[PDB]
């Protein structure tokens, strides 16, 4: 009689992998992402909601701002 | 930038 | 008779992996991410909600701001 | 008759991994992240809520601000 | 930047 | 920046 109610998971779950060789070169590059079996999570809003015979309200906001004045 | 892996 | 109610997980879970060689070079690069079996979580808002015969309210906000004036 | 109610986990759980070689070079680079089986969590708001025959309210906020005036 | 791994 | 690992 399992219940998962009002639960969240953010990130990564790994079971029993292998990764041999991951070589990477970034030269004179603005942005570079090398991801292997990983989660790179940026600037997300996620809402899960269940209501039963009730009232439920959520207000969620994310502001991600990045400036690079050179 | 000589990344030389060698297993 | 398990229950998970009102629970959260953020980050990473690893069971029994291998990672042999992860070499990386960043030269004259603004941003560089090398992720292997990992969670790189930045600027997230996550809301999970269950209400039953009740009233439930949530207000959540995240502000991520990064400035680099050169 | 297990219950997890009102519980949170933030960070990392590892069981029985291996990581042989993780070499990294950052030269003249603004930002650099090398993550292996790890959680790098920054600027997150996470809310999990379960209400039953009750009233529940949450207000949560995160402000992350980073300035580098050169 | 000569990252030379050698297992 | 010569990071030379050698297992």
Residue numbers in the entry:
A (entry chain A), C (entry chain A), D (entry chain A): 31 to 100
B (entry chain C), E (entry chain C), F (entry chain C): 1 to 7
Share the article's original sentences:
α-Synuclein is a 140-amino acid protein, over half of which (residues 7-87) consists of seven imperfect repeats, which are lipid-binding domains. They partially overlap with a hydrophobic region (residues 61-95), also known as the non-β-amyloid component (NAC), which is necessary for the assembly of recombinant α-synuclein into filaments. Upon assembly, recombinant α-synuclein undergoes conformational changes and takes on a cross-β structure that is characteristic of amyloid. Neuropathologically, it is characterised by the presence of abundant filamentous inclusions of α-synuclein in the form of Lewy bodies and Lewy neurites in some brain cells, including dopaminergic nerve cells of the substantia nigra.
Here we report that the cryo-EM structures of α-synuclein filaments from the brains of individuals with PD, PDD and DLB are made of a single protofilament (Lewy fold) that is markedly different from the protofilaments of MSA. Still, for each case, a minority of filaments (~25%) was twisted, allowing their structure determination by helical reconstruction. α-Synuclein filaments from PD, PDD and DLB are identical and comprise a single protofilament. We termed the structure of the ordered core of these filaments “Lewy fold”. The reconstruction with the highest resolution, 2.2 Å for case 1 of PDD, showed density for main-chain oxygen atoms, establishing that α-synuclein filaments with the Lewy fold have a right-handed twist, in contrast to the left-handed twist observed for α-synuclein filaments with the MSA fold. The Lewy fold is formed by residues 31-100 of α-synuclein, which arrange as nine β-strands (β1-9) in a three-layered structure. The first two layers are corrugated, with the first comprising β1-5 and the second β6-8. The third layer consists only of β9. Two additional, partial layers are made by densities (islands) that are not connected to the rest of the ordered core. Island A packs against β5; island B packs against the N-terminal half of β9. The reconstructed densities for both islands indicate that they are made of peptides, but a lack of distinct side chain densities precluded their identification.
